[PDB]
Nucleic acid binder design. Structure first.
Ligand code: MG
Ligand code: MG
Ligand code: MG
Ligand code: MG
Ligand code: MG
Ligand code: MG
Ligand code: MG
Ligand code: MG
Ligand code: MG
Lengths: 114, 206, 96, 98, 127, 79, 150
RNA sequence: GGCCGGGAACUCAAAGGAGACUGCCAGUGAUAAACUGGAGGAAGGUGGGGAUGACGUCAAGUCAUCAUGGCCCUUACGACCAGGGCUACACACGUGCUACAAUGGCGCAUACAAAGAGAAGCGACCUCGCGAGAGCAAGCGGACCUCAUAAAGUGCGUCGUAGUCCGGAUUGGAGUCUGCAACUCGACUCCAUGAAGUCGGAAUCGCUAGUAAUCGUGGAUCAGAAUGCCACGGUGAAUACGU
């Protein structure tokens, strides 16, 4: 089921499947179950109607999918358009966590640019 | 450069420490500093005193400072004058009741530090570097001992290129822990360059 | 060693004691959860070098800021140099 | 009922101080607990030997802090002072406690 | 009557108490299996036993500490075979014949300086 | 920015910036306390932050507060 | 070199008691995890011994009988040229190599769990079916094809 | 509950001593040295490992530890202060850590160790906190107390070979603590994000046994920045014809 949108995890346990929802990890997923009244081993797919209904209803609290990936980029901009070292880093494809650039950074900049 | 320090590699056996005194981690650190301050002063104020060793014991807030000089007379002075003089300074330099006992010497020609400190002095006196070597050796080997090895560093004769001199008589097994060797050095500050000196005196095995 | 620097350390020592020793407490005091006082938190501005985390030990003998051993209070070098002449008690070539 | 923390750098020395405290204390009443050894704490010291570069050099030293327990049972009036009449050796260290 | 056997290997100190009676085995105040049960360990302990009858031979009191799994097991086996000599100084010849009386002088090597693990020499590559 | 509880700043900028609050905006503020957090009092003020070379015309802004006057003045020159 | 070691005596198989089987477990063993090894050797040694119906060490032996090389080439740098010369493999080596090949090939059988893989490869071997036997074929073909130097 | 008397046996602690010499046996070797096995024994062939590095070689390294001949700087190459830089990044090379998973991941249960550190320290107990951590405050200068409830492992269960409950980089939001001071540039916690990576060319490195491999533990430096260094123990291989 859409649950939060598109994402339709099946077979996998409710917990490990719920995580598929863009914006939740082992924590948010493991809690949403009990909080809603669902086991862990329970297969989201095999689950009965209500056993999937509450999910959506409760996951509506925390932000997910779009909104997240959406506003998440806004926060990145807020500082970029600001002009602080942080933002400045992004508009330069350089690490903000204060790492070393002279070496190791392929994840930030990318593969060699010889 | 190799060869481990003998007196150091023997600090456990056949060779006693030069500062036997207990102390905990806290003040152990500062405890050495004073040990250091007193030594240099006791060494400067006692130039031609011909002192070789200078043990240092630290009992209950007290200090020992046992000097092993070849010329005690001067170290003593007029009725213990010189000695008494030093004692006060030490106590002040260490900030505690310090003492000072004198120790004679079993022939200077057989003591490391002495033979060294001396052999070096001669150099400053513009004496044939080579002569001093053999001279000091001859005596040591004569007054006893079973082995000796003098070694003068570089810049001998004032050559543009420094070169270490050798020479040594008798057996000097530095590899034998159970050999006991009187080793000591002394730098000779020449008119144009320092000149290290190392003396190896083997008295007896066990 | 650098004489200038060698003395530089000393000053920072006295200051730290002659001041913060009996003043730095302010932190756990007006600058801690009791009544945390922006005012008192702005007062600390005056000593500076009085801070403890400003020393560098340095070799008592020489002054090597690096090679150091709290125990002997000397630099990695001097330790070995002196330890060999038996100037340091109970210290000898360790092996096992 | 009185403990004696004996600490020396070399066993040769410590043993003497111990055998001494016990020796005299044996003829002043107390039966004494006994010259117990206890584990020896040995601080090690690894340090570069060569100046500048040559990390694969280094040199190791150590300090074996020997100790004894002693502790005299059934103390005595004279016994206590009997220790003042005997307390030397700079290499050793005592710490009489309860 | 009752016998005792030290036994130790790889810094593993063990204490055995050879005592006549069926064949109980209690290590560290616990069952032989409650320590090495269903493990390739509770076999070596019986080795000296299985070699000269057990289960219906006698019961010992094991008290081992220091070391590890294989350490404990191996250690105990030593104490046992050791104490056995007390009950009968003859069976030794056989115990020894099977490499028992001996003590594994094998011990972890101290990490030498310069190396990376007592022997592991870090690659220098560039020659 | 971790400072647990208590936005820290240097006394200098404070006594100086406060004057600006009343006297109103005007010339910059030659300051080196780039490690001090920006406050809403200096909001849109004429400040100046050092960076090894010299000072830079730093002006406070709405959201530009919980930050340090320094994270707005780049130091190292890069192409 | 001058040294003259030999065959480091190995502890006999626990659940059985066969020296050969023992070393087979070591070859498969990894990270000094001897227990984990046995937990895999037997599990697979059983799932197979079952099918074959006969005792493990039999189905085990048969499997090896195939993956058993008799000769191999030995590099030789004589005369500025590395001539590949074959030679009959000693008895002890024969069993070793076989076991090594079996595991090394079984480990990369893309199955689900090591155990299952081992079991399969062990079977295929008993009838020149798996990769284990394959190796021996390529190795044996190396020889003869160099019999000239032989 | 060694908990209590009590017991000095045992483990241990730590000072002294015994023990291994090719000493003994036989064989090869000239009836030598030796070598090869065997006995006895905890250990056998300089038992294992340290420490110990000849005469000298490289005008090898270090005037930045220190010392020093000479030469230079002496309102300046000297001295002080704040901020910045030494953490720059389009690159390349060496040394490492963690991965690519099922000899594994994850959950729960749960067993065995060594060696060390500590009054400006180690810091429990209990209280609060998702957690880092905070409050209160005992004990220990230490086989008493604390750091400290080892990891692999063993049981059970789940996962199902998937770029996958693999792997964690990156980054976003919010916080703890150290120190005047965490922008530049600290460590860590929480939620979220979840890259590359599917065992790596030519070439190349270490290691012959408690070694390799693997798994944890402590310390020095130190307010606060270890995957480094030094050190400890658990588990525990393969192979050696031959030059
Ligand atoms: Mg100077
Ligand atoms: Mg510091
Ligand atoms: Mg290890
Ligand atoms: Mg030798
Ligand atoms: Mg040169
Ligand atoms: Mg100069
Ligand atoms: Mg650097
Ligand atoms: Mg610490
Ligand atoms: Mg630390």
């Amino acid at each position: 089921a859409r649950i939060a949108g598109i994402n339709i995890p099946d077979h996998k346990h409710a917990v490990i499947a719920l995580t598929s929802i863009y914006g939740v990890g082992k924590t948010r997923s493991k809690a949403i179950l009990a909080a809603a009244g669902i086991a862990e081993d329970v297969k989201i797919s095999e689950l009965s109607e209500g056993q999937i209904d509450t999910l959506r209803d409760e996951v509506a609290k925390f932000v997910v999918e779009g909104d997240l990936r959406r506003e998440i980029s806004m926060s990145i901009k807020r500082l970029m358009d600001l002009g602080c070292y942080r933002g400045l880093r992004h508009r330069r494809g350089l690490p903000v966590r204060g790492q070393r650039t002279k070496t190791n950074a392929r994840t930030r900049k990318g593969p060699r640019k010889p | 450069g190799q060869k481990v320090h003998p007196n150091g590699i023997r600090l456990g056996i056949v060779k006693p420490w030069n500062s036997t005194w207990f102390a905990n981690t806290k003040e152990f650190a500062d405890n050495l500093d004073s040990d250091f301050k007193v030594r240099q002063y006791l060494t400067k104020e006692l130039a031609k005193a011909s002192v070789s060793r200078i043990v240092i014991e630290r009992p209950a807030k007290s200090i020992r400072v046992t000097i092993h000089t070849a010329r005690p007379g001067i170290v003593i002075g007029k009725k213990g004058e010189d000695v008494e003089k030093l004692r006060k300074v030490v106590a002040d330099i260490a900030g505690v009741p310090a003492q000072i006992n004198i120790a004679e010497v079993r022939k200077p020609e057989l003591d490391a530090k002495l033979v060294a400190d001396s052999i070096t002095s001669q150099l400053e006196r513009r004496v044939m570097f080579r002569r001093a070597m053999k001279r000091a050796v001859q005596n040591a080997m004569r007054l006893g001992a079973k082995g000796i090895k003098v070694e003068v560093s570089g810049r001998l004769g004032g050559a543009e290129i420094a070169r270490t001199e050798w020479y040594r008589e008798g057996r000097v097994p530095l590899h034998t822990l159970r050999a006991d060797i009187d080793y000591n050095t002394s730098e000779a500050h020449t008119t144009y360059g320092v000149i290290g000196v190392k003396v190896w005196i083997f008295k007896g095995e066990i | 060693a650098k004489q200038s620097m060698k003395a530089r350390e000393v000053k920072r020592v006295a200051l730290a004691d002659k001041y913060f020793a009996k003043r730095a407490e302010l932190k756990a005091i007006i600058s801690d959860v009791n009544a945390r006082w922006n005012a008192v938190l702005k007062l600390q501005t005056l000593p500076r070098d009085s801070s403890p985390s400003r020393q560098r030990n340095r070799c008592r003998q020489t002054g090597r800021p690096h090679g150091f051993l709290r125990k002997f209070g000397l630099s990695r070098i001097k330790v070995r140099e002196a330890a060999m002449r038996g100037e340091i008690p109970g210290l000898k070539k360790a092996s096992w | 009922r009185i403990r004696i923390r004996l600490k020396a750098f070399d066993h040769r020395l410590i043993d003497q101080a111990t055998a001494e405290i016990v020796e005299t204390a044996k003829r002043t009443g107390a039966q004494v607990r006994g010259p117990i050894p206890l584990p020896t704490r040995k601080e090690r010291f690894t340090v570069l030997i060569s100046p500048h570069v040559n990390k694969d050099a280094r040199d190791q030293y150590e300090i074996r802090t020997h100790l004894r327990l002693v502790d005299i049972v059934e103390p005595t009036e004279k016994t206590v002072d009997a220790l003042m009449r005997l307390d030397l050796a700079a290499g050793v260290d005592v710490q009489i406690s309860l | 009557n009752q016998y005792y056997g030290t036994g130790r290997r790889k810094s593993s100190a063990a204490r055995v108490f050879i005592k006549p009676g069926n064949g109980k085995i209690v290590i560290n105040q616990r069952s032989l299996e409650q320590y090495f049960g269903r493990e390739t360990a509770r076999m070596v302990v019986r080795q000296p036993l299985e070699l000269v009858d057990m289960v219906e031979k006698l019961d010992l009191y094991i008290t081992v500490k220091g070391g590890g799994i294989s350490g404990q097991a191996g250690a105990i086996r030593h104490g046992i075979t050791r104490a056995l000599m007390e009950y009968d100084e003859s069976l030794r010849s056989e115990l020894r014949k099977a490499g028992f009386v001996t003590r594994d002088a094998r011990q972890v090597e101290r990490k030498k300086v310069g190396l990376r693990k007592a022997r592991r020499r870090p690659q220098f590559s560039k020659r | 920015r971790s400072l647990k509880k208590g936005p820290f700043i240097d006394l200098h900028l404070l006594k100086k910036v406060e004057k600006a609050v009343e006297s109103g905006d005007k010339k910059p503020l030659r300051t080196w306390s780039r490690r001090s957090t920006i406050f809403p009092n200096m909001i849109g003020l004429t400040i100046a932050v050092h960076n090894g070379r010299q000072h830079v015309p730093v002006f406070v802004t709405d959201e530009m507060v919980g930050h340090k006057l320094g994270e707005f003045a780049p130091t190292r020159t890069y192409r | 070199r001058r040294r003259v070691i030999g065959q480091r005596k190995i502890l006999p198989d626990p659940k059985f008691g066969s020296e050969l089987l023992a070393k087979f477990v070591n070859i498969l063993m990894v990270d000094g995890k001897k227990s984990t090894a046995e937990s895999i050797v037997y599990s697979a040694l059983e799932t197979l011994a079952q099918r074959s119906g006969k005792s493990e060490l039999e189905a085990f032996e048969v499997a090896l009988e195939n993956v058993r090389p008799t000769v191999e080439v030995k590099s030789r740098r004589v005369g500025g040229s590395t001539y590949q010369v074959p030679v009959e493999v000693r008895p002890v080596r024969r069993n070793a190599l076989a076991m090594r090949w079996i595991v090394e090939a079984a480990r990369k059988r893309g199955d689900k769990s090591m155990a299952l893989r081992l079991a399969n490869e062990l079977s295929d071997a008993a009838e020149n079916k798996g990769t284990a036997v394959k190796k021996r074929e390529d190795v044996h073909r190396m020889a003869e094809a160099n019999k000239a130097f032989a």
